[PDB]
Amino acid sequence: HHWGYGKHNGPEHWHKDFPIAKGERQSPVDIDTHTAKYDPSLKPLSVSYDQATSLRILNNGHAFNVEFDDSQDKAVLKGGPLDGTYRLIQFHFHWGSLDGQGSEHTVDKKKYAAELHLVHWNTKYGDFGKAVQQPDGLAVLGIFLKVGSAKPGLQKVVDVLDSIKTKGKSADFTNFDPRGLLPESLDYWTYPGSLTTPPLLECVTWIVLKEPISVSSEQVLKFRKLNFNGEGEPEELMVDNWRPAQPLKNRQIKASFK
Numbered sequence: 204h205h206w207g208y209g210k211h212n213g214p215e216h217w218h219k220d221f222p223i224a225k226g227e228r229q230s231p232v233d234i235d236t237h238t239a240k241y242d243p244s245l246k247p248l249s250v251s252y253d254q255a256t257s258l259r260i261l262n263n264g265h266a267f268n269v270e271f272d273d274s275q276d277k278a279v280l281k282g283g284p285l286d287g288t289y290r291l292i293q294f295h296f297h298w299g300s301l302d303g304q305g306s307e308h309t310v311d312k313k314k315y316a317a318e319l320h321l322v323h324w325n326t327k328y329g330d331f332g333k334a335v336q337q338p339d340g341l342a343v344l345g346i347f348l349k350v351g352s353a354k355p356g357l358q359k360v361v362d363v364l365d366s367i368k369t370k371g372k373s374a375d376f377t378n379f380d381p382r383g384l385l386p387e388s389l390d391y392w393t394y395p396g397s398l399t400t401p402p403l404l405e406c407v408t409w410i411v412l413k414e415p416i417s418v419s420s421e422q423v424l425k426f427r428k429l430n431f432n433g434e435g436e437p438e439e440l441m442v443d444n445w446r447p448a449q450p451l452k453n454r455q456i457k458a459s460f461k
């Protein structure tokens with residue numbers, strides 16, 4: 204057996220193999236907009252994805268990862284609450300079976316249809332492996348997805364999903380520009396958290412954008428055609444691969460805007 208999002212291996216079961224699931228800085232969390240406080244110490248956020256080099260897209264049995272070449276400082280995230288440079292390594296999404304759910308973070312308890320996670324690691328630690336052994340090893344830029352108008356920049360991702368329907372399948376995915384997945388505004392909320400999937404390591408500085416991007420019903424419907432299962436096995440649609448909000452505990456969510 205292995206962790207997943209089913210009734211028998213879902214979020215409520217994770218703590219048995221990953222005790223940190225009940226830790227002090229777990230993610231995601233509900234973002235109470237009225238309790239979040241504007242933080243003047245936050246520096247301007249810098250998303251520099253101009254030289255991003257995508258390589259492959261993979262169905263890992265939980266979601267699909269668009270992987271990037273992080274052997275050189277190309278796609279980096281800096282500024283904001285971040286100290287130093289964080290390099291983009293991959294991005295993936297979390298989505299629901301219906302438009303009314305799918306996101307991991309929530310805003311005033313509101314759930315979006317999906318959530319995009321752009322994962323970056325602190326270059327001061329040399330590699331991703333070492334970074335996840337540090338309290339400030341990672342920075343994940345989270346972007347909410349709502350259903351409405353199509354997102355042109357997402358279509359290339361959608362059209363390749365048919366080739367990676369099942370767990371373990373991958374496909375070349377070069378020259379994809381992640382800048383086409385960003386909303387207009389970079390206003391955000393930030394707080395110290397963790398990976399939202401096992402191992403649930405608490406090494407993440409979360410930066411969640413306030414402005415969601417709009418994707419079409421057709422685009423998200425194709426996300427829902429993916430499979431959690433591997434080839435030749437009974438079909439288990441890849442839907443609702445999101446972890447619910449976790450206790451905030453000793454943390455404050457800061458806003459980059461007034």
Ligand SMILES: NS(=O)(=O)OCCCCCCCCOS(N)(=O)=O
Binds near residue numbers: 320335343398402
């Ligand atoms: N949803 S999230 O963005 O918070 O996180 C997803 C998992 C990200 C990958 C985590 C892999 C952890 C194992 O790293 S290792 N082998 O030790 O280098």
Ligand SMILES: [Cl-]
Binds near residue numbers: 209210
């Ligand atoms: Cl199921």
Ligand SMILES: [Zn+2]
Binds near residue numbers: 295296297320399
């Ligand atoms: Zn994620």
